[PDB]
Amino acid sequence: LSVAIIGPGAVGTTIAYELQQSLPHTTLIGRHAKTITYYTVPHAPAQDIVVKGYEDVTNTFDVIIIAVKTHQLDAVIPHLTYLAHEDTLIILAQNGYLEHIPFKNVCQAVVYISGQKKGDVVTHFRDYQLRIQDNALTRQFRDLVQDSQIDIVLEANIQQAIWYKLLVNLGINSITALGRQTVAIMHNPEIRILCRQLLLDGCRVAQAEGLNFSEQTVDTIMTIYQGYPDEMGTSMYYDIVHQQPLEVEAIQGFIYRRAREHNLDTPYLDTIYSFLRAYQQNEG
Amino acid sequence: LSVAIIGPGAVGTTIAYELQQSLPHTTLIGRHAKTITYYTVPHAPAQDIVVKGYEDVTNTFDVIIIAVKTHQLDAVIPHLTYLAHEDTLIILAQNGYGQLEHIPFKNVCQAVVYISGQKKGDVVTHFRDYQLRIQDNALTRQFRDLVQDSQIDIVLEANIQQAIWYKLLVNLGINSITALGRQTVAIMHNPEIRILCRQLLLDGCRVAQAEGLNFSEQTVDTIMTIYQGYPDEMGTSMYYDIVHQQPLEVEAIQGFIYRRAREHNLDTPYLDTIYSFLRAYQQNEG
Ligand SMILES: NC(=O)C1=CN([C@@H]2O[C@H](COP(=O)(O)OP(=O)(O)OC[C@H]3O[C@@H](n4cnc5c(N)ncnc54)[C@H](OP(=O)(O)O)[C@@H]3O)[C@@H](O)[C@H]2O)C=CC1
Ligand SMILES: NC(=O)C1=CN([C@@H]2O[C@H](COP(=O)(O)OP(=O)(O)OC[C@H]3O[C@@H](n4cnc5c(N)ncnc54)[C@H](OP(=O)(O)O)[C@@H]3O)[C@@H](O)[C@H]2O)C=CC1
Description:
It is classed as oxidoreductase. The structure is a homodimer. By secondary structure, chain A is an alpha/beta fold. Chain A is 41% helix and 24% strand. Chain A folds into 2 domains: 1-156, Rossmann fold (3-Layer(aba) Sandwich); 157-284, N-(1-d-carboxylethyl)-l-norvaline Dehydrogenase, domain 2 (Orthogonal Bundle), CATH 1.10.1040. In chain A, strands 1-2-4-3-8-7-6-5 form an 8-stranded mixed barrel, surrounded by 4 helices. The radius of gyration of chain A is 19 Å and the shape is globular. Residues 6-12, 30-31, 67-70, 72, 75-76, 93-95, 111, 113-115, 117, 235, 247 of chain A line the site of one NADPH dihydro-nicotinamide-adenine-dinucleotide phosphate (NDP).
């Protein structure tokens, strides 16, 4: 069973490194060939991991994990024609919420792996977990990686897990990015009020999509946010302050488009999405 | 009838220059004596404008026009003890609202400012317009008459509340959007932004109504129409302030509207969201 990871970033390098410890043929693919210097944890002995460029990879793979940013998926897609066969299992190790991918077996994963890439140096911080829809192919993949540190959690129905992370992202990523601030911005009472209202907007969309969320869910997420230290950023905050594109369309945009589909009133979500969309269009 | 302007900036210098053309004893006052540069329009020949420092002034004025930013008003107030007599007409030529009561004088009036210009250091460039709108009363009628030979257009309003709130809304929509968006008005080419803009104006309208103003969806439409006339490169003062990492005039504008919304227990989600971010910026910069 052949395995590729596409996207040698924080998440992709972590997955490739750890899978290569038990499955040494596992292949890490980027735009061009290079070598990433990888730390399993901060201050660990450095480890180099080989990246093959698209042009270097001639064969097809049974499993392909895509770990690029959501706004980078469209650029990856055409390469799949040569990297995958009709039955290749394709796993999106990305945030947000597939139909753009012209293959039968495409699965959206929920990523619980924390790390950062600076230049060609990747530092993993904590966690090795992917939550994926439980099916024949993902069970087979789970079995394949059993001697690695990668924790594949199979969900009888992956929608709840996807939407839960969608909501966790929705509140604090929107606020820190639009606010151009670390999570310390939550010390403003008005910002916390906004954050809860924004989560409530997201929650009512999740509900109309058939998910079992509620005000309790919002309380739980606000409680998680209270645990974050002041200096903590979010991925969308880092992207906006470094003038990079945002993952907005697959996160706030997805939630927004579902809100409209259900004719919901979501003023907080709408406001947040309008500004993040405007940023994205300016960056284009 | 003597006139002073406090605040040698875009608005204050425009008013001083034009009033000095017909009322040469009109005095422009700043923190320190200097001579600044004024352009009547861009590329016009420079005009020297004399600025007297507070320490130089040894007389009172019958009319004092305060032309500073909203958050700068508190620092001006103690100087009025030395510049005004009991009956002095004080005109607060300033955006926002809710600050008139801070001025301990009986004759205090807001002016709604329709004068466009920019101050950079000691250089003021006027762009267009020369209008102030002020409540109609005996003292403002006397002031209007005084300045009749100048280019300054004093419009006396039967009820100044309307003009004040109209301007609050005009600021509320495009200044919040450009500032939070960190963009010129070109940001309005995004249809989602125009939808938000209109919803934001509607929140503002609902607050105005609770304050007793006859604003409606027609009012909102007229303001959206005005926005459609702005060229892409145009900024707003709040936009310029936020990109310059300066304090904003938020507390007397979006802040005031927000506090009135809470006072009336209204549901104003767009306004609340906008204010929450502008306030967070202000708390971080301060
Ligand atoms: N802690 C984390 O980092 C977490 C991340 N996630 C999610 O995981 C996903 C990946 O995030 P993350 O690893 O942080 O992102 P990174 O920016 O660290 O990695 C993305 C990688 O993909 C590469 N890439 C970009 N375009 C292409 C392309 N067309 N073909 C091949 N490779 C490409 C980039 O290369 P280049 O350097 O040249 O741009 C970069 O190496 C995101 O959706 C994120 O939201 C979720 C939880 C935590
Ligand atoms: N186009 C425009 O400029 C328009 C402005 N307005 C409104 O008019 C008001 C004035 O704005 P604008 O003229 O642009 O602002 P400016 O910053 O151009 O002018 C403010 C001036 O007041 C001076 N000042 C500040 N504090 C004091 C003090 N304690 N004592 C004496 N002088 C002081 C400042 O000094 P220093 O030079 O040292 O900073 C500056 O010269 C604002 O509320 C604005 O929203 C309304 C419509 C248009």
